């Protein structure tokens, strides 16, 4: 089932629009925030937009897109904080500490700025 991407950094949902741009929206009601996480193998994740069949990508310089297609660059660490919370590492870059991230304006962080423990890093799966 389909899920809502909550950042409690700015109180936005992640969001990929369809230039393939990612980033936040506060509107519940958008299109692109529908996500469908599935897993690989145990305690990794595929995000992808139901609206457009983007997968969840981040690039070799830390930014985060839209992939019209699964590769390694779209694999993720879902890890759960007992909040509920969750992070999602770059498996790609996992050495280098490369999380998926929002700033407080719904503006995409990147790899290189983000840190364990940001609220930024942080997402609550919501029902859609």
């Given at each position: 089932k389909p899920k809502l991407l909550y950042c409690?950094?700015?109180?936005?949902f992640l969001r990929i629009l369809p230039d393939g741009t990612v980033d936040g929206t506060?509107?519940?009601?958008?299109?692109?925030?529908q996500l469908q996480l599935s897993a690989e193998s145990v305690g990794e994740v595929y995000i992808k937009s139901t609206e457009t069949g983007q997968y969840l990508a981040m690039d070799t310089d830390g930014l985060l897109y839209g992939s019209q297609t699964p590769n390694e660059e779209c694999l993720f660490l879902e890890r759960l904080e007992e909040n509920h919370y969750n992070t999602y590492i770059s498996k790609k870059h996992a050495e280098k500490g490369w999380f998926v991230g929002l700033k407080k304006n719904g503006s995409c962080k990147r790899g290189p700025r983000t840190?364990?423990?940001?609220?930024?890093?942080l997402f609550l799966p919501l029902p859609v």
């Open positions: 409690s950094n700015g109180g936005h506060r509107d519940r009601s958008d299109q692109h925030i840190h364990y423990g940001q609220k930024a890093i």
